Symmetry: C5
Subunit: 205 residues, 5 copies
Amino acid sequence: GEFQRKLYKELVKNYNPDVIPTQRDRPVTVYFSLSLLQIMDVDEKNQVVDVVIWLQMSWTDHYLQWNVSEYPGVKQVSVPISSLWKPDILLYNAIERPEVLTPQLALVNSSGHVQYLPSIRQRFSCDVSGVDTESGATCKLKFGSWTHHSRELDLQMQEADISGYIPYSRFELVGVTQKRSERFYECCKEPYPDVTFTVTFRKKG
Amino acid sequence: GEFQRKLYKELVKNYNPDVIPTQRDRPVTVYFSLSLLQIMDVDEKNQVVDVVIWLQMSWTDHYLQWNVSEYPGVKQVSVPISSLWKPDILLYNAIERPEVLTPQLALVNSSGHVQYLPSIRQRFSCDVSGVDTESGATCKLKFGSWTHHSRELDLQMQEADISGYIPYSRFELVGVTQKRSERFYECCKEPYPDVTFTVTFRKKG
Amino acid sequence: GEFQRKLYKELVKNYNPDVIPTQRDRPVTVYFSLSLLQIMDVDEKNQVVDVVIWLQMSWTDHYLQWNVSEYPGVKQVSVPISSLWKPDILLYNAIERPEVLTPQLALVNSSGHVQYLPSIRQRFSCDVSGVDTESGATCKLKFGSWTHHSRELDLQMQEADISGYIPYSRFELVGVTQKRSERFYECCKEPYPDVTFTVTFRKKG
Amino acid sequence: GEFQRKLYKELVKNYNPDVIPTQRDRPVTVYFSLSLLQIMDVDEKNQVVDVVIWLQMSWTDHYLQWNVSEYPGVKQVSVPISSLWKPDILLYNAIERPEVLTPQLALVNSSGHVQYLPSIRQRFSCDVSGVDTESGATCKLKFGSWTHHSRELDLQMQEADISGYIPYSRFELVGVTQKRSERFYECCKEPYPDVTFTVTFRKKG
Amino acid sequence: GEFQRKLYKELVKNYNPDVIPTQRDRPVTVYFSLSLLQIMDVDEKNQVVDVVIWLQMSWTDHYLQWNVSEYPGVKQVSVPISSLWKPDILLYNAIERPEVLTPQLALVNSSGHVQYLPSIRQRFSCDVSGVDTESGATCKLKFGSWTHHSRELDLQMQEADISGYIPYSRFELVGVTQKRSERFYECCKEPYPDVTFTVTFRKKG
Ligand SMILES: *[C@@H]1O[C@H](CO)[C@@H](O[C@@H]2O[C@H](CO)[C@@H](O[C@@H]3O[C@H](CO)[C@@H](O)[C@H](O[C@H]4O[C@H](CO)[C@@H](O)[C@H](O)[C@@H]4O)[C@@H]3O)[C@H](O)[C@H]2NC(C)=O)[C@H](O)[C@H]1NC(C)=O
Ligand SMILES: *[C@@H]1O[C@H](CO)[C@@H](O[C@@H]2O[C@H](CO)[C@@H](O)[C@H](O)[C@H]2NC(C)=O)[C@H](O)[C@H]1NC(C)=O
Ligand SMILES: *[C@@H]1O[C@H](CO)[C@@H](O[C@@H]2O[C@H](CO)[C@@H](O)[C@H](O)[C@H]2NC(C)=O)[C@H](O)[C@H]1NC(C)=O
Ligand SMILES: *[C@@H]1O[C@H](CO)[C@@H](O[C@@H]2O[C@H](CO)[C@@H](O)[C@H](O)[C@H]2NC(C)=O)[C@H](O)[C@H]1NC(C)=O
Ligand SMILES: *[C@@H]1O[C@H](CO)[C@@H](O[C@@H]2O[C@H](CO)[C@@H](O)[C@H](O)[C@H]2NC(C)=O)[C@H](O)[C@H]1NC(C)=O
Ligand SMILES: CN1[C@@H](CC(=O)c2ccccc2)CCC[C@H]1C[C@H](O)c1ccccc1
Ligand SMILES: CN1[C@@H](CC(=O)c2ccccc2)CCC[C@H]1C[C@H](O)c1ccccc1
Ligand SMILES: CN1[C@@H](CC(=O)c2ccccc2)CCC[C@H]1C[C@H](O)c1ccccc1
Ligand SMILES: CN1[C@@H](CC(=O)c2ccccc2)CCC[C@H]1C[C@H](O)c1ccccc1
Ligand SMILES: CN1[C@@H](CC(=O)c2ccccc2)CCC[C@H]1C[C@H](O)c1ccccc1
């Protein structure tokens, strides 16, 4: 519609997607969770697991809010993620780049809350030497911001999901746990948070 | 011609391809169908099917209409899809990104009706454990919009085609059925439609 | 030179590469031919042939002509194909995208005649059962425009070449024929032309 | 914040990322180090090693400094590396391009000191003929600027790290040493520095 | 420095990288040579050789010259090749696109002489049927401009080098010759030069 077209024009004006949208030394809170959809393969020689994981991220960007009565009918909009600031979140265990399977779009509502929910095909490093035993292999998937400390980007955790796991693969899911942490690194004065998912699985008999 | 060159210049003016062309809370109807052209391979270990499928989409964009007597001779135009809004339709079963085999162009007529008909090479997840039996393996291919609900994008179905199936592959087509659906999801207020194709096939001999 | 630099500046001015350069309801004639340079491989299980083919296309674009005495010395220019309109010609049998081996440049002379001669590495679908016999496998390579009918784009044929075929591959060339055709499709009012190359070949063992 | 947004706008103004930020017979000093995170594979037939290495680079760019009291609260910023000048450092032994695993971002503080710390997946040439012996295979990894001599770009060395080496691969790390050098080449009047890492490793069992 | 920043700004002004820098019907002379650095593999079934080759090209572009006393201290500059005109030189035997291993930068001195020295990973077609014999397989590598004839681009030859050949591969170098030539092709009125390298090699006992 015409109201949407006018809204998109205003949202991009004076907006720099390279600048994290903090406000007066108050961090941007980013909620992060993961749904393991499939274990595609396990390479026992090279110590590699191949997965499809659906990442779910959300945060508030105060530059993206609008008055609902100025734009009647427009409750939320669909925007390419390249036009917004997004978290620079990395899988620390990754040995190749991710392949993104979903359209690179985010949903933004009228108070500036953004949802970006990419599904990714990803290969990563793990010791899979007990994968073909009763107590299987257990792998850690550590996620965190690459360039923003706790006072800039407050990474927070949400409930993990196993309901979407594909039943017909040759691996079964024994368990999934999760834990937020915070550490000081040698480089830097400020601490950096992370969210780590621990996945235990094994080959089907 | 000169009239075409002037028309393209007007069509792009004040046009944002990121904004779905709804008008006064009336959704954009999108007709969707599929023609299975080939089954290239079946990976029985990893539970993957490799296909070429020809997707057929059409819809009306009211911003792309023109007066026929202002542009005499110009009944329709060939336009790169990147310059238009297009449906953000996703194959939910996909485990890699699609490879598009056709030129990325759409046809638009004078009342703003768009046709975009991409042929794609695609690999996806399915239980193929009865592929080498009499009754065969049966796979679901679920398609739907990633960011637009029913009141924005009204996805509608059309008749599937088996006539283009390649006769000389090592798999034969036992059947194809189709079904539109509509559900409420936990996330969201508004319902989401989808179009699902069920394909049954088996190995020859 | 200085005259060339001035000419390139004028050629791009008021030029839209998305608009086919028809003139007063007279189609653009496009001459098309093919030289088979190599048969790299044949996949008997999956019914795929791997080739290098040199495509040769030429046409007249009336917007690219210049007065020879305004630009003395300048008989023809070398221009990136991305800055011109080009035919949207497709190999209908293709199962992957082409890999272009040559620089993406075209030659344009002073009366606007364009030559664009890409060499491509291409895999396509064919029944190759019979490849290891005396009479060999016979494959059709069908080429045509994706979005332009006969009254917009008049596809014409030229003499096929076998002189560039590499003698040291493990496949030998039994024969090559070619045929222009024109058909009505279900979609459309206007007929669409094509040029099809029929290649018969066999294993040397 | 608002001060950050204003700062980014000023940093890009009159800034050319193609120009090395020397001033008047001072070179740009670039500190370089490496942390070997994993040996993924060794191809004994083709003489190739496959690694993940974390490169650590830092330098001062005097065009990126700002007055701290003009931008209160803003001590450092996160910037895409493509918008800055960066060292043109090359692995001389490389037989494919690198695959970058981390976000392409750098940290810049108020006096213009830049940190850029890419983790890369890289394959390179080495004689691995004693890899399955007690004393192991020993490989040289030579790094240096491609276009800048010593008086433009002063490459300096820092302490190598083995603490991040993954314990569960099928190769073990016998040792890592490092050495800065400087040589005259036939081409050029000015000498060129390099930093070379020598890595000795062997197969387990 | 400040003089460099001013120089880069002037060099790009009124510069079109698509226009070969001839001057009053006098061709651009391009010196071309090759250093074979490695033979990575030989595929005997498909008739393919896999190499790393270091190409060395240089030429004069009269638009890139500057007065040395206007820019004191600035003898040469490091510039991205994408901002300059470069030779459109092709390996005629290539069956895949090249992978460029070096930074895409060129050196330009004050009288406008450009040096561009890309190292490339390349696969090409050759009859390797005597590779495992005493006299070896002999392959021709033919290089030439794709769109410029002799009167536009004067391709000249320089001394080949085998000093960079890697000693630890499983193939050894029997012989290398080189030869400049000039031929008429069917397309065109004007003759086209080429530089061909003949490499004889064999498997090690
Ligand atoms: C740019 O390149 C193009 C492509 O090659 C080139 O187009 C060709 O131009 C020539 C004109 O010189 C065309 O040849 C003519 O074609 C028609 C028949 O189709 C004939 O009338 C001409 O024959 C002769 O007729 C006269 C008898 O009354 C004689 O006086 C004399 O012998 C004529 O030559 C002649 O064959 C040719 O058809 C086109 N081709 C295409 C595809 O358009 C163009 O000329 C080039 N431009 C420049 C400035 O170099
Ligand atoms: C925009 O979306 C956000 C996030 O969904 C909404 O804020 C949440 O609203 C729920 C209502 O049950 C609260 O329980 C949460 O505390 C809110 N979340 C956060 C992170 O603050 C918000 O209401 C939406 N705004 C509008 C105007 O629709
Ligand atoms: C533009 O294309 C549309 C879609 O083909 C045309 O509208 C259809 O015309 C058919 C056949 O005459 C009718 O039966 C349908 O009612 C129409 N379908 C839809 C989805 O609207 C339309 O006529 C074309 N416009 C012009 C100006 O020719
Ligand atoms: C910007 O960062 C650089 C690098 O960390 C700082 O320079 C170093 O400061 C330490 C003290 O923390 C000194 O011991 C070193 O001598 C400095 N190193 C170099 C290479 O200069 C610099 O002080 C920082 N600037 C600000 C304003 O904080
Ligand atoms: C820019 O570089 C070119 C090429 O290196 C220089 O010209 C060469 O100089 C050598 C050495 O004296 C001469 O023998 C040759 O006549 C030149 N070679 C070519 C291919 O032209 C040139 O002098 C340099 N310009 C400046 C100002 O230093
Ligand atoms: C959850 N998702 C909805 C979420 C949403 O609208 C959304 C939010 C944010 C950005 C983009 C889209 C929209 C579409 C329906 C549903 C999709 C299905 O659950 C799903 C999730 C993960 C993998 C495959 C399928
Ligand atoms: C510290 N370092 C990471 C260190 C780590 O544990 C790590 C990284 C990669 C592989 C293995 C371990 C943790 C997060 C902070 C980061 C440093 C900062 O983000 C940074 C990024 C880019 C340029 C300069 C500085
Ligand atoms: C596609 N169709 C016509 C439809 C059209 O013009 C068109 C309309 C809209 C967008 C793009 C092309 C064009 C001419 C070719 C024909 C294609 C053939 O049916 C086909 C397509 C794909 C696989 C097998 C067969
Ligand atoms: C060429 N290069 C110099 C840079 C330079 O002169 C140059 C670079 C690019 C363009 C013009 C000139 C720096 C010193 C090393 C030298 C070449 C090295 O031995 C090399 C090693 C392995 C593969 C390729 C090249
Ligand atoms: C290309 N053609 C000439 C150039 C030209 O007229 C031309 C080039 C590009 C566009 C338009 C015209 C000279 C350059 C090579 C020659 C063709 C060679 O036999 C060839 C051999 C093998 C595969 C492909 C091509």
